[PDB]
Amino acid sequence: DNGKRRDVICETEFIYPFGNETADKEIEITIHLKADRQVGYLYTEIPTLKYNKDWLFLMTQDDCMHSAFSYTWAAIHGKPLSYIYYCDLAHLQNGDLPPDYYSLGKTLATTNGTGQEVRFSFGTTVAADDDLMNTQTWVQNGYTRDYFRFYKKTMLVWGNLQEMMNYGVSIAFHDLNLPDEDKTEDKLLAQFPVAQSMIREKLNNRTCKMLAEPNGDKNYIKAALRYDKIRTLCAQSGATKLYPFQENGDIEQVVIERAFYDPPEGSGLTNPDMIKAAILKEMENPKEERAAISIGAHNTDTGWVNFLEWLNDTYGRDGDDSMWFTNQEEYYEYYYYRLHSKPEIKQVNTHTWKLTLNLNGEDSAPFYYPSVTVNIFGLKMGDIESIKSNEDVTGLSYGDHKDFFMLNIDCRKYLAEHAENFVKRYEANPTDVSAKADANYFVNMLKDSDKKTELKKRIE
Numbered sequence: 482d483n484g485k486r487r488d489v490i491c492e493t494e495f496i497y498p499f500g501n502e503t504a505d506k507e508i509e510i511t512i513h514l515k516a517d518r519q520v521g522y523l524y525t526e527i528p529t530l531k532y533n534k535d536w537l538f539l540m541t542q543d544d545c546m547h548s549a550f551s552y553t554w555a556a557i558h559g560k561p562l563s564y565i566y567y568c569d570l571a572h573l574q575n576g577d578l579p580p581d582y583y584s585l586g587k588t589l590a591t592t593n594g595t596g597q598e599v600r601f602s603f604g605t606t607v608a609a610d611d612d613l614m615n616t617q618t619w620v621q622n623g624y625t626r627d628y629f630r631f632y633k634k635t636m637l638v639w640g641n642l643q644e645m646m647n648y649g650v651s652i653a654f655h656d657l658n659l660p661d662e663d664k665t666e667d668k669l670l671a672q673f674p675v676a677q678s679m680i681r682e683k684l685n686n687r688t689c690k691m692l693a694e695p696n697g698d699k700n701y702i703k704a705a706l707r708y709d710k711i712r713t714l715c716a717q718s719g720a721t722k723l724y725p726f727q728e729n730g731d732i733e734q735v736v737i738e739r740a741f742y743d744p745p746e747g748s749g750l751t752n753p754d755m756i757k758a759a760i761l762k763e764m765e766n767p768k769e770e771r772a773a774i775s776i777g778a779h780n781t782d783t784g785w786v787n788f789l790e791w792l793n794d795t796y797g798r799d800g801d802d803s804m805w806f807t808n809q810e811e812y813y814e815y816y817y818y819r820l821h822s823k824p825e826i827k828q829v830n831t832h833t834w835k836l837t838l839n840l841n842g843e844d845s846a847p848f849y850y851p852s853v854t855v856n857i858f859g860l861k862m863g864d865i866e867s868i869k870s871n872e873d874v875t876g877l878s879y880g881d882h883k884d885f886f887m888l889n890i891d892c893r894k895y896l897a898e899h900a901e902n903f904v905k906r907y908e909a910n911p912t913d914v915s916a917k918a919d920a921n922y923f924v925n926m927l928k929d930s931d932k933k934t935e936l937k938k939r940i941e
């Protein structure tokens with residue numbers, strides 16, 4: 482019965498197997514040149530920003546907000562949106578949508594510089610030790626007497642967050658669930674692994690490695706720095722302002738500055754208005770002098786949806802494609818690779834070169850964004866007869882960029898299986914246009930292979 486009320490625990494049918502991700506990657510890419518395109522010398526680098534982007538936008542949404550799913554994630558990923566209501570995952574799965582629902586008609590993304598979509602990425606804080614994440618969702622297709630089931634919940638339900646993990650959304654600690662008088666440095670330190678155990682239980686054994694400082698409370702930073710699973714942190718004060726082209730040191734356990742860009746009281750402006758103004762001011766400088774635009778958000782809304790669309794239209798795929806819009810965890814990992822991984826290219830014979838690189842994360846937990854860009858100077862796409870790669874490479878896209886050649890290399894161990902899970906979801910929901918779009922998006926992340934060919938055929 483489609484019209485009967487059900488109260489369910491939101492659940493998604495697969496979650497990327499974060500616990501199984503391999504910590505160490507060994508990249509070997511073999512480049513075979515055309516006969517009359519023998520080159521004498523090639524050399525390589527990992528550029529400052531992934532995809533050879535010019536500038537960095539970081540976004541972390543605090544307070545484990547329902548709108549992180551219903552507004553932020555939904556707008557990026559081409560999902561149904563509302564102007565005043567808050568869908569849960571089960572509403573989307575069942576087609577029980579609020580009475581004002583609409584869609585932007587596109588996802589919000591940059592490209593990777595080699596012809597593929599890269600949807601905007603962000604992080605959300607998680608109230609993992611708070612039982613309110615276990616709240617049920619009321620689903621009732623066709624019920625119009627009221628819309629209470631679409632009201633804002635106090636925080637995300639676990640199923641919403643689980644699904645967001647499938648799209649690369651990151652996670653951070655924030656407030657911990659202790660009495661206020663027990664929020665001492667020592668007691669917060671003991672509670673971090675308790676919250677971590679719940680994160681791992683619910684998010685397929687993903688380990689959280691980030692703290693977003695809550696309430697300006699420096700006890701959280703002091704405690705977090707004694708908990709070695711946390712590798713990156715953000716705060717509005719007591720932090721380091723990130724200049725991506727200038728930062729030269731280790732950022733392990735460093736507090737990166739973030740700002741909320743609150744508008745002056747009664748000025749009629751919104752946080753997105755303030756962030757837009759800050760972006761425009763920053764873009765007047767040469768890229769090497771620019772600070773990262775490192776933002777926090779609380780509740781997101783229609784104004785935020787329109788702002789994300791403006792970013793897409795101005796600096797993303799429908800604009801100048803100059804921005805890397807990501808979460809702080811993915812950036813932290815990329816910076817780590819750039820500092821510690823050393824790509825090398827060696828000539829094998831007159832017409833064959835081999836590019837090698839290791840991606841090794843930190844000893845605490847496996848890094849979850851093992852993808853990099855490598856530039857090759859002295860090579861052009863037109864020189865190349867074929868490119869082959871070893872098993873650790875699961876995604877591989879490449880092409881010319883300015884006067885050199887770039888490769889986007891993804892080493893997520895279970896990427897092909899993840900794409901196939903999106904294909905199976907589409908096959909089970911073949912009339913859902915967004916499901917088909919997601920399947921195509923994830924399949925296009927894969928390197929050329931028999932599996933990619935099989936999955937493409939299934940989603941024709």
Ligand SMILES: [Zn+2]
Nearest residue numbers: 543544695696
């Ligand atoms: Zn907060």
